[PDB]
Design a protein around this ligand. Structure first.
Ligand SMILES: NC(=[NH2+])NCCC[C@H](N)C(=O)O
Ligand SMILES: O=C(O)CNC(=O)C(=O)O
Ligand SMILES: [Fe+3]
Length: 338
């Protein structure tokens, strides 16, 4: 399937044109599971600078890369083969950028799970990634206003959840395939409101569109992980690399809040004949936000930070971050926040 591309206005005000655009965005997700947004010169420049920083960092020796880790936050380095999806190793190397909180921050002092300072490789890499993430966040907020408008909801419905949102980014390098291994990342869904992603010209992202009659697991429930689901089953859409766009698809929270009117798009990565750089950005609720059903009055909620924490613990069962959460009973804070 050949994807739709939209140009977003710099500001979303709720004018009648914004409602029509929002309607189109929703309908593109309901048809294809994904759409593209055009990038302007600055958005593209910041994307390329981040990609270049990623390539330069990956050239560092492994001993140095592996030192960029923290027992407070999941930010930092993930070696190729380290992450687990559905019990199988994923092959990118990754640098994850979560909210960059100093040890003087009150949430860090209180010992909240996943809160702490990014173990940056250096200040030059830091600046490239922070500038990119700030730009990505402006796009996320436009998209959330448009999504609310397309559902004829109050314009701030989703952005009210993203104040000091737990936005984060996975800066990825996928190695080349071998004749017997081509799994980059197993099939999965991501966890928050939106996923905005950039990729180089190599290719390897596949997404699953909505399928009439197909039951979808609710990955915010422990008994219904979406990891590995549909891995070997049609249909999978190849997201062809296209110059001058970012891709956008929903995460688990949007699926929950919309009652399945939007689905959290399953996706996976195949290793190609060349190494592949990509960046995946997650526009998320505040860690303390409680997502709720928009169209139902049911009692179910998703505590976003609980979902993030549960997911990252399953991704990284042996990481020092996970060990410290378990040792210090940091999950108790979530019970308290709830
Ligand atoms: N941290 C991530 N977004 N990881 C994406 C891959 C899927 C992840 N390993 C999982 O089990 O859910
Ligand atoms: O590499 C890509 O284009 C897709 N990346 C992801 O889905 C991810 O890391 O969660
Ligand atoms: Fe993903």
């Amino acid at each position: 399937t050949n994807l739709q591309t939209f140009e977003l206005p710099t500001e979303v005000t709720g004018c009648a044109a914004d409602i029509s655009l929002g309607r189109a965005l929703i309908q593109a997700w309901q048809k294809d599971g994904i759409f593209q947004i055009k990038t302007d010169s600055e958005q593209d420049r910041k994307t390329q600078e981040a990609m270049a920083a990623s390539k330069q960092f990956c050239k560092e020796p492994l001993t140095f890369k592996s030192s960029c880790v923290s027992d407070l936050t999941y930010s930092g380095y993930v070696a190729s083969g380290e992450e687990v999806t559905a019990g199988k190793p994923d092959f990118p190397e990754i640098f994850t950028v979560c909210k960059d909180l100093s040890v003087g921050d009150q949430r860090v002092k209180a010992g909240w799970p996943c809160h702490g300072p990014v173990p940056w490789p250096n200040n030059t890499y830091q600046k490239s990634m922070k500038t990119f993430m700030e730009e990505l966040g402006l796009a996320g907020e436009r998209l959330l206003k448009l999504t609310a408008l397309g559902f004829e909801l109050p314009i701030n419905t989703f952005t009210d959840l993203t104040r000091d949102g737990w936005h984060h980014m996975r800066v990825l390098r996928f190695p080349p395939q071998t004749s017997t291994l081509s799994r980059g990342i197993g099939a999965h869904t991501d966890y928050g409101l939106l996923v905005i992603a950039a990729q180089d010209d190599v290719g390897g992202l596949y997404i699953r569109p909505p399928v009439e009659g197909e039951k979808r697991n609710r990955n915010w429930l422990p008994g219904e992980s979406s990891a590995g689901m549909f891995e070997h089953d049609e249909p999978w859409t190849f997201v062809t690399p296209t110059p001058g766009v970012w891709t956008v698809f929903p995460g688990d929270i949007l699926q929950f809040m919309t009652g399945g009117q939007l689905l959290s798009t399953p996706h996976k990565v195949k290793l190609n004949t060349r190494e592949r750089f990509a960046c995946a950005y997650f526009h998320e609720p505040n860690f303390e936000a409680s997502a709720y059903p928009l169209f139902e009055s049911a009692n179910e909620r998703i505590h976003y930070g609980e979902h993030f924490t549960n997911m990252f613990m399953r991704c990284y069962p042996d990481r020092i971050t996970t060990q410290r959460i378990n040792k210090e009973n940091r999950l108790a804070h979530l019970e308290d926040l709830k």
